[PDB]
Structure formats: C-alpha cells, structure tokens
Design a protein around this nucleic acid. Sequence first.
DNA 1: ACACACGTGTG
DNA 2: ACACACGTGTGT
Length: 416
Amino acid sequence: SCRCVIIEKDEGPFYTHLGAGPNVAAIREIMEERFGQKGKAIRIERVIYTGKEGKSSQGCPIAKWVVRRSSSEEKLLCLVRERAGHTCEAAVIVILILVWEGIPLSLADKLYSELTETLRKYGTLTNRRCALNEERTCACQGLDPETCGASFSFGCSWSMYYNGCKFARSKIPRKFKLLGDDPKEEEKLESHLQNLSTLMAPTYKKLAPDAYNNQIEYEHRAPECRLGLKEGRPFSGVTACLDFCAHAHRDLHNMQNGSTLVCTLTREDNREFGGKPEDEQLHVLPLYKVSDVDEFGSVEAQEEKKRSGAIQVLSSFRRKVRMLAEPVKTCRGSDEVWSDSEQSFLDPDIGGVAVAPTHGSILIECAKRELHATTPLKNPNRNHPTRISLVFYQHKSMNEPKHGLALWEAKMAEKA
DNA sequence: ACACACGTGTG
DNA sequence: ACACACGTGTGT
Ligand SMILES: O=C(O)CNC(=O)C(=O)O
Ligand SMILES: [Fe+2]
Ligand SMILES: [Zn+2]
Ligand SMILES: [Zn+2]
Ligand SMILES: [Zn+2]
C-alpha cells in the first residue's frame, strides 16, 4: 500500500489490525483514544526487528531484556515497531498490547485456585510441538509426569481432516472434556472459561477494534464454534498453560488478521507490585531487541528505564539442565548437560525482548505472525504453578454452523 | 519439496 | 485397551 518499496522480511511481518500510524506520536493518539486516558497511563516501547532469534545452547527460550511494569500509574503497555525505511501512513505498527489491570484481582485469585485444582485432578494434557525444543530432547517442562508443566486446550479447534472444526462428527461435542465422565466438573470448568471469555471480549473490542471486528464477522454463522455468553464473541478456543514452556513458535492454525489474548494468573508469592518472586515466567519475542530511545526519542529517558528496572538488561547465564536420552517421538533415561547463553548475549542483534505479565493482566499479540515464546520455570509444578496463562484465539476456517457438520455429511455424500 | 501438527468417532 | 479413516498449510 506504500511506495517506500517491495516489502520483505527484513522489516518484520507487516500487519495493522492491532494499530498503525505514521509515527510513534500517532500511536499514542490512537491508544489514548481507545483506552480513555492521556499521559503517564500509557507506555510505548519501540522494539527493533532483527530476524536473529535468541535461544539457549539447547535451543530453548531465553530473554535478553525484560519490559516490566514501571509503576502502578502505568496502565497500558504498547510495543511498536517502526518499519525500517518506511515514511508512509503505516510506518509504525503495534505488535503487542498489555493491559496491566485486565481482570478483577478477586477473579484472578479465584481462577488461579479453581483452574489449578480442576486441571491437575481432571485435566487431559494436550501435546503440542512447542512443548519441546527442535531436537526434541530437552526437559523444560520437567520430568516428573505428575508435576511437569502442561497445556490443556478447550473449545473448538481446526482440523486438517475436515479443514474445519474438529467437532464436525460429534453429536453434542464436549468443549471442556476432562478425564472420565464427570459432567458437573466439566460444567464448572466451562462456566469459569465462558465467564472469562465474556469478560474479555469488550476489552478486546476496546483496545484492538480492527482485530476484534475481524473475529466476530461470522459470529451468527458459526455460533457453536464460538465461546462467550453475550453478543460479540471473538473467541473459539482457549488453552490453559500451567508452568508450560512454549518454545519459539507461531500459532499457525490461528485465523488470519486476528490476535490472541493471554490472561495471566500467578502463584501467590508474586502478586504485589514491588515483589521478589522466587521465580517467574516471561513472555518473549525472540526476533526483537530494544531501542536506544524511549517512546519520545530520548536516549537518557531509555537509560533511566534501564537503571530503574522498568527495562531490565539481563546478562548471560550458564546453568545445568537435563537432556532426554531419546527424543520424544511424533504423532507419526536422562543425562545432565550444560546450557549457556553467552552467544546470544555477545551479538547485540540477537533478539529476546520479554514482557513480565502480572497477575490479572491481559496481553494482546498477533501470535500467527510474530515468533513468540515463554521461558521455562526453575521447578515446574502444574499442581502449584508459578504462572497460568489462558490463551484465547480463533482458528482458521471456523465459520460453518454446527461445527461444520452439514458440510461433512455432504462431503461423505460424494460416494461412488 | 516435505516433515509435522492447541484430534475424534468409528469398529 | 487397540486400529483405522478423514487429509491443510506453513516455514524452511
Ligand atoms: O502464555 C503465553 O504467554 C504464551 N502462550 C503461547 O504462546 C501458546 O501456548 O501458544
Ligand atoms: Fe503461541
Ligand atoms: Zn526446551
Ligand atoms: Zn511505507
Ligand atoms: Zn466447533
């Protein structure tokens, strides 16, 4: 759409549905309008796309810079990318929005408790490729099967076998299936996530209207493939991640021109603004580094944030981890090894920009397009997790009524 | 190209 | 508890 000219990967994935404008100043104007507040309440960080991925010696997620909530006065964090070379009307795009005070703290406290107890006792683990490094030998979730970090997926999901909702053949699908057949437990679980899906829809509409609008386009066509209890239902699936290390990946089944909302819950020792948690999980963009200047282009302003901790400049580590003796085999013992990261820290252009999302916060990013990851916990324990994330998304080709049951019957009706 | 996947209902 | 049928996109 611009004659800056064409457009490549050197500048990063291009999209505007989280927001775009000719300069950082214009982004503040958009965000102040959406959020209803001007000034210190909104924080914008410029991040530079380098295309060079930060990872450990074993190929597992690491951070290099941590963007942390600067003060209780900061309500909304915005990460932006100024696209290299562009002077057009979409020169600066929004790649992540973080609402610090996303849901009520009393609900976050209760969801932390309810989801942990329900899922550890009744949850069916969902196997995902991003649970493992590329060599598939790492142990970032932990090795105790009773306690290891894990991911549980609910709602509707896309299926290559139907090119549509996996529930195409299910009379009365179970969107929140738990081990056994305890309907009362599944209904409680369902009610919590349906309620939360209902609470977050308006927050999504408010802060990322274009993305939100794309996700409700076929709401009245495929309502069986949407969550939520009130008009305006952008979400289709929800995944709960309990101390789960999501290795660098993109959410490739996600619908184009959408986004994912991540609601973070944290263990009880990490719920005060100025607190030293024994551990914490971070959300990382491994292809980005931080700028030398703040939102307004001041070097000293950026240096003040570095020494204040609002941007935590991390340093290299050398730790001992476990490596599986055999890789985990695909759908189709252990030994100790050193894991380093000096190499990611020696190159200033190897990326690793992390945010530290708080209890009850809401994170919005286009996970289909941006490589993203979560850091492994020191002692993962899904029975008492350091962090729970609830990832709300809509997969592609989820626009048929009744989970696509009509097209499937019509499909098999092409018979001989 | 081509290995791989936030699966489920049949029998 | 198993086997089998159904078959898409992407990043590289
Ligand atoms: O929990 C987070 O912050 C990110 N989670 C994911 O990217 C995922 O499970 O696909
Ligand atoms: Fe993801
Ligand atoms: Zn790993
Ligand atoms: Zn341009
Ligand atoms: Zn469905």
